[PDB]
Design a protein around this ligand. Structure first.
Ligand code: H77
Ligand code: MN
Length: 295
């Protein structure tokens, strides 16, 4: 009856030589990582970019998420600090223990029980899709808006700074987004527009739990998802259906869809490959930055 964790996706720990350029590194790991849809990359231990958001003025209105909205068939303004106090209070009250003592496996098991629970109605909030143009990127940027210390210039010029990723697509003829998470805040199964790659960096906080499906199984997932979707949504275009495609990974696994998981911890990157379906949820109060790119 309880959730069975999918197998773990690949984790790479490049040396300083292998860490010189993200595009080259991703191209090298592609033979393996494209067979798992997602992978995790741990930078060298000394690579520690400072958090460069304007924390004093960081204010936002998160969106309300009802975990069991599919089975069942608002706007308060926070600062970073006040959302964190709300987030920690929620999780410690929910589990009756300090937030850092809750095992990742237990939050994962409870999340999926809640998504299918018809008797318990859990509602959470997600500071999602915050533009880095609003209060700045979490990475230091040579934009002139904020001041960069000498020890920070290396990170402003790093290829792994998400503001320095190639985002322009080649054809005959984008900015990173920010995510402030709390326990159980989540994202539904989707692929990126134009089947792009995405790269995701967790600046700080509790882990972000991911699930990924390799691209060779994309059509298989789509058929399972539409076979099991409510009939009212069955004929909806993909771009709209993706707004509500919450589905337990074990259900996909029972239909033969390969699924991998990972816990992305603070300071780690997750890369999603072209047409690799992914979904996930946050273990607690955290702060992530993400951008789409093409190769
Ligand atoms: C594809 N979804 C729309 C399906 C809906 C899922 C859902 O139920 N709730 C939800 C709430 C807020 C944002 C989003 C998605 O927003 C995409 C961001 N994009 C740029 C800004 C404008 C909108 C599109 C995300 C995609 C994504 N992918 C990887 C990791 C994360 C993460 O949160 O860490 C996210 S969040 C989802
Ligand atoms: Mn995505």
């Amino acid at each position: 009856a309880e959730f069975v964790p999918p197998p773990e996706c690949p984790v790479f720990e490049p040396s300083w030589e292998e860490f010189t350029d993200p595009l080259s590194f991703i191209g090298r790991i592609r033979p393996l990582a494209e067979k798992t849809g997602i992978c995790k990359i741990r930078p060298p231990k000394d690579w520690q970019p400072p958090f460069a958001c304007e924390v004093k003025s960081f204010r936002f209105t998160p969106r309300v998420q009802r975990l069991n909205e599919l089975e069942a068939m608002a706007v308060r303004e926070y600062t970073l600090q006040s959302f964190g106090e709300m987030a920690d209070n929620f999780k410690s009250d929910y589990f009756n223990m300090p937030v850092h003592m809750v095992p990742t496996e237990l939050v994962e098991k409870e999340f999926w029980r809640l998504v299918s629970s018809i008797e318990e109605d859990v509602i959470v909030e997600y500071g999602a899709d915050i533009s880095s143009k609003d209060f700045g990127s979490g990475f230091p940027v040579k934009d002139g808006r904020r001041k960069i210390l000498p020890e920070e210039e290396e990170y402003a010029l790093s290829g792994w700074n998400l503001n320095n990723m190639p985002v322009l697509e080649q054809s005959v003829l984008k900015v990173p987004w920010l995510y402030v998470g709390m326990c159980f805040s989540s994202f539904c199964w989707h692929i990126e527009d134009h089947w792009s790659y995405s790269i995701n960096y967790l600046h700080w906080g509790e882990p972000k739990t991911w699930y990924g499906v390799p691209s060779h199984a994309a059509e298989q997932l789509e058929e399972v998802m539409r076979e099991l979707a409510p009939e009212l949504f069955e004929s909806q275009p993909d771009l709209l259906h993706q707004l509500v495609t919450i589905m337990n990974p074990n259900v996909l696994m029972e239909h033969g869809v390969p699924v991998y998981r990972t816990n992305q911890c603070a300071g780690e990157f997750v890369v999603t490959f072209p047409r690799a379906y992914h979904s996930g949820f946050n273990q607690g109060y955290n702060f992530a930055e993400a951008v789409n790119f093409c190769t």
